[PDB]
Design a protein around this ligand. Sequence first.
Ligand SMILES: OC[C@H]1O[C@H](O[C@H]2[C@H](O)[C@@H](O)[C@@H](O)O[C@@H]2CO)[C@H](O)[C@@H](O)[C@@H]1O
Ligand SMILES: [Ca+2]
Ligand SMILES: [Cl-]
Length: 496
Amino acid sequence: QYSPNTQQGRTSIVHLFEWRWVDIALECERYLAPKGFGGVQVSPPNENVAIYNPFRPWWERYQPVSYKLCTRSGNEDEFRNMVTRCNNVGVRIYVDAVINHMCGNAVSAGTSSTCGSYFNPGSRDFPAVPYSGWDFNDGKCKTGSGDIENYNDATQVRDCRLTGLLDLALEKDYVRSKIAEYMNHLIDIGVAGFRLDASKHMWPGDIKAILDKLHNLNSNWFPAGSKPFIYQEVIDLGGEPIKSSDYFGNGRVTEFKYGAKLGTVIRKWNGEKMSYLKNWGEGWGFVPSDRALVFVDNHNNQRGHGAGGASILTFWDARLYKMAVGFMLAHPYGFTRVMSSYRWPRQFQNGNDVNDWVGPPNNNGVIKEVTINPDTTCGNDWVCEHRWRQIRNMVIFRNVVDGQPFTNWYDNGSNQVAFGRGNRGFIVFNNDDWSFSLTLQTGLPAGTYCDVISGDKINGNCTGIKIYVSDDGKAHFSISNSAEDPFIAIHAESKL
Ligand SMILES: OC[C@H]1O[C@H](O[C@H]2[C@H](O)[C@@H](O)[C@@H](O)O[C@@H]2CO)[C@H](O)[C@@H](O)[C@@H]1O
Ligand SMILES: [Ca+2]
Ligand SMILES: [Cl-]
């Protein structure tokens, strides 16, 4: 459950948030495969509640109605088509599994679901599965509201309703079997792993029980005996009775302190500075690297919905964002997930975004197609950070120096730091309010390298900056604090 199941040489996965199956399938063939991306985390593929007030929010996909592969992203046949096409070109698919609960207990009964299945929250009736009042924790929860009220009580956090969401009785074998039946359907189709949503709200033991009933990955694409990659969404910042380590036996966990801390460091908040990143990783109290799934931002914190807070860096802060993602992809700590978002009308009212619910670009509910501009960018309001040259080239950088030790560290005691990865890559950052101009030891073989942040290497030429490494491995670097991108990265595959 700890290995991504990616093809050799691919070290990152990208979250194509709310994308349609047909668009992901094309992206796999025309872009992800040739650019070295390892896999794609997709939005929940199972039927959810269609919420019209507000109008089709992104979070409606976290309110299951059944396990039918029928959503705004497409139907079962399109889902199968995408997984097959992606696998065939070497890019894995990771499914967002919402198995801790069903929909809001106050949602009206009827057929307001992405696939028209009938449901009745009030009587706990989900005939499309089927589930009944017997399959929920209504009797198990002890709070007077039926919802979670105190997060210092590990018991209610697991047996009570998370913000009113009908909480499934995951201890019952019937329930575990229904969920496993859904998950095995996905595995046989070709998926390589799963993101387990709201894992902190499920007992680690119930999760194991469910994982016990799972098949091995599809033998047409994976080696015999391969287990699905598992990463659980556990929001664990400081002192809480529940800890991330409680889930190490099921697979990896999301390390939410990663982005929260990196964000305040890059922003230079509360006295933090880049020179402190010298012992980044476990040194900062993070979970062991072999159990970590890291990221700068996620879909549920880039819009204030969760762990991270105000330090969280997103595409809205493009300059600092690229630099944070650049640092993450260059540093050996954890397995990295890249975010891919859509733009929405941010509308702050007293420091809070009142439009944080807004769903993907659409036309009366129908998700808009991801268009590709002649300059390789995306249209129709899709940000496509994974297509930004600076992010894209850092994704390749991580593949190139994979397995190389963190070495040749340098810092000016403030926010000008550099470090290498064995003799395969080197990166330099300038986050101070003055220019950087110094000759550094790179640990790389002499030669001319193309800077992959400002440009690309093409048939024997660079389209951006060029770095000259001498016989002694030294190279001069000049970065203005006013530079578009105050960082430079070079690697073995960018050598001319
Ligand atoms: O009880 C239903 C619940 O739905 C929405 O909650 C969202 C939550 O805001 C998102 O962060 C994500 O976790 O999915 C949840 C389920 O859709 C509403 O925002 C919330 O007020 C409401 O009670
Ligand atoms: Ca629960
Ligand atoms: Cl996550």
